[PDB]
């Protein structure tokens, strides 16, 4: 009856009870998202609420145990988790208010709809409407309008709240011995005692700012290329040495340059790594899609989906007489009860998606052995990276012919490739900086390094440095754009999107050299290779069990996030660009502006 021995027996009780409440919570949450009625929705809460109850109870109960008295390190790790000291350390007044804030921001962002200044009787929501505009509109003004309309109505409104939002949130952090709400988030990456596998809540910032450096060349160059391309799209509205106008980047914030493919495509005279037709032309149905993906993973020495998986899962839109949420989703309801929700539609996008999702399911199972509190990805990124690993292999024309969705006779030429390759930069390499500057800004704002009256004059002072992008109208502290984006005005660790990006590649490399790959890194298809599968299943079955660094090791074979393998995926490209930019200017002046004066 030591201090450990007592905790030992605590967790044991927590595990068996959490398994039942959590299962009850998911099943309800499941019946809703797949039947949306009144009885099913009301229910979702009761169950969800009970599970919410059990937590605070069990959290402010794990206090009985002073962490520093643990030898079986695991216990400390678990105990640590239950130590979600929530937002209790505050005052019932503040905690109340805090949640009142979050909630508003959330509903403002969800409800906020702007109305046509040139047709007050008509209005639009972010999605669709506004977003519909930011992706397809070629009207410099219409784009300009929506961009400002949004950051002008809801933006401003969120300014007050965010201001208070910070303080309170910061207060919390400090109490728990964290430098700020910032050093809080960074926590997710921390490691304590294990030798050569530790990691500080600060080295993230180092290893991020370090890695990001090696990416600059590739970025500057992609930037420079799309720039001139845009210069043609929006004649005269751009500077050949200046930055890029925020309302012109494929979506409402410039998150991803994806939608710019339209007018940046290297060779318009190329066509289909789109089997969408081939699928419909072969009468493939839902089942085929998922059944086929099951094969893929088997092909690398992993298991068939559970007998239950097929019995419970929802693979096709129920139609009417039963309304349901169609976000494709992986489900790990626990009790060895896995399943996917997808309103499947015989297309390629969906076909890859189905693989991506079955990747999550694959990860989930792998770590089912681990104790209830360790059943997750090494970190926030790991789980998404694992899924995108699959999307990567299945997308190869190689794998597509391999399966009979692409006429065996089709031969890939190095131009259709540059395409795809850049259609990638647009998404993978466009959001990289956008992400680094974002979190860095919140990051700084949380170490106080950025005053309330320079909150935009600091935003865009780095948007013009890190991202080489400009504001089409200047903003004052009336506006609060760094929050105009879901992830921010709804409180979320946004750095995941960065780290998950590298991780997914060192994983893709690790698996190609292991599965013996001869062509350029993006031609890889781990498919049919079991030996490289084994290499995956090591970092997989760990769950949160080890330090992500060890987890990373197991596959890649290193102990840190190296960007060199991303650069590798984008090397046939990287040069093709230095070539287009022989006459273009590579870089940008932080001073140039679209509005002028």
């Amino acid at each position: 009856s030591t201090t450990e021995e007592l905790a030992k027996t605590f967790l044991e009780t927590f595990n068996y009870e959490a398994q039942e409440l959590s299962y009850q919570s998911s099943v309800a949450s499941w019946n809703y998202n797949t039947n949306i009625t009144e009885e099913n929705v009301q229910n979702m809460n009761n169950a969800g609420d009970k599970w919410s109850a059990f937590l605070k109870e069990q959290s402010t109960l794990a206090q009985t145990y002073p962490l520093q008295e643990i030898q079986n390190l695991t216990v400390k790790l678990q105990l640590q988790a239950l130590q979600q000291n929530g937002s209790s350390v505050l005052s019932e007044d503040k905690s109340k208010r805090l949640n009142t804030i979050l909630n508003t921001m959330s509903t403002i962002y969800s409800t906020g709809k702007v109305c046509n200044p040139d047709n007050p009787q008509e209005c639009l929501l972010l999605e669709p409407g506004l977003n519909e505009i930011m992706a397809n509109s070629l009207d410099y003004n219409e784009r300009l309008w929506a961009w400002e309309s949004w950051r002008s109505e809801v933006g401003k409104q969120l300014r007050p709240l965010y201001e208070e939002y910070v303080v309170l949130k910061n207060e919390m952090a400090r109490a728990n011995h964290y430098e700020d709400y910032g050093d809080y988030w960074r926590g997710d990456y921390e490691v304590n005692g294990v030798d050569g596998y530790d990691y500080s809540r600060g080295q993230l910032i180092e290893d991020v700012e370090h890695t990001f450096e090696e990416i600059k060349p590739l970025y500057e160059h992609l930037h420079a290329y799309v720039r001139a391309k845009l210069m043609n799209a929006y004649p005269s509205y751009i500077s050949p040495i200046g930055c890029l106008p925020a309302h012109l980047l494929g979506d409402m914030w410039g998150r991803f340059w994806t939608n710019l493919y339209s007018l940046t495509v290297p060779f318009g005279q190329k066509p289909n790594i789109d089997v969408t037709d081939a699928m419909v032309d072969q009468a493939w149905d839902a089942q085929r899609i998922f059944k086929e993906a099951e094969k893929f993973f088997v092909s690398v020495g992993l298991p068939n989906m559970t007998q239950g998986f097929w019995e419970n899962s929802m693979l096709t839109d129920p139609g009417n007489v039963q309304k349901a949420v169609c976000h494709p989703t992986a489900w790990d309801l626990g009790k060895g009860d896995f399943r996917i929700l997808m309103c499947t539609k015989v297309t390629m996008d969906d076909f890859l998606t189905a693989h991506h999702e079955m990747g999550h399911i694959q990860y989930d199972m792998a770590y089912a052995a681990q104790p209830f509190l360790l059943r997750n990805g090494a970190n926030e990124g790991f789980h998404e990276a694992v899924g995108e690993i699959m999307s990567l292999s299945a997308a190869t024309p190689k794998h597509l012919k391999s399966i009979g969705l692409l006429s065996p006779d089709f031969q890939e030429d190095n131009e259709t490739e540059i395409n795809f390759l850049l259609k990638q930069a647009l998404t993978i390499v466009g959001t990289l900086p956008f992400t680094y500057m974002l979190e860095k800004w919140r990051w700084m704002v949380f170490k106080g390094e950025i005053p309330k009256d320079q909150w935009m004059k600091k935003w865009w002072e780095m948007k013009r440095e890190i991202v080489g992008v400009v504001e089409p109208v200047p903003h004052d502290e009336t506006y609060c754009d760094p929050a105009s984006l879901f992830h921010v005005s709804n409180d979320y660790s946004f750095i995941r999107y960065y780290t998950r990006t590298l991780y997914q590649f060192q994983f893709q490399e690790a698996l190609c050299q292991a599965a013996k790959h001869e062509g350029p890194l993006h031609k890889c298809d781990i498919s049919n290779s079991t030996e490289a599968g084994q290499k995956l299943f090591n970092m997989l079955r760990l769950g949160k069990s080890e330090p992500w660094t060890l987890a990373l090791e197991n596959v890649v074979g290193a102990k840190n996030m190296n960007v060199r393998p991303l650069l590798n995926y984008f090397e046939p490209l990287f040069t093709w660009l230095k070539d287009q930019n022989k006459n273009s200017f590579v870089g940008w002046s932080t001073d140039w502006s679209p509005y002028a004066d």
């Binding site: 009856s1 021995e5 007592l6 027996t9 299962y23 019995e311 419970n312 060895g336």
Partner: protein, 173 residues
Amino acid sequence: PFGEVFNATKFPSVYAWERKKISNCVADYSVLYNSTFFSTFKCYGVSATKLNVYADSFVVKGDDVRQIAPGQTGVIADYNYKLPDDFMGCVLAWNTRNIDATSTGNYNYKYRYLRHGKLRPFERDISNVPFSPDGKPCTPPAPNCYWPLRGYGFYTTTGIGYQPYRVVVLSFE
């Protein structure tokens, strides 16, 4: 005579398992030889006939079936049912999701997970006194107080590993 344990309407909960004694009787074993129905038959003794007994029945989780066999640390064999390291006969099981599992959960089947000491072969424990890892008599919701018995709660929709399987341990002497 066996038709009363197998085929039986209701089954006992592990910790409180039921032992049947069949004296002066004969059965072919062929009602058992065939019918794949069973998901387990490991017979730690033989597999023939000689018209010559013990038959304990109860219900455990799926993956918990692994534990009804000699050796095997437990948590089920440590605290609910322990088969002798040596002396043996047979262990039998079948899936009963529809009989013992509901769509809302059926927490009627229990198992002990907290105990002081391990169960010596064939032993049984129906105690139900608040547990504490030192002996201090408990009184919930006091700290470090747990009721040693818990429900399984078999939902019709859970993994085969977490589905209700009934067990009959036929022991010969």
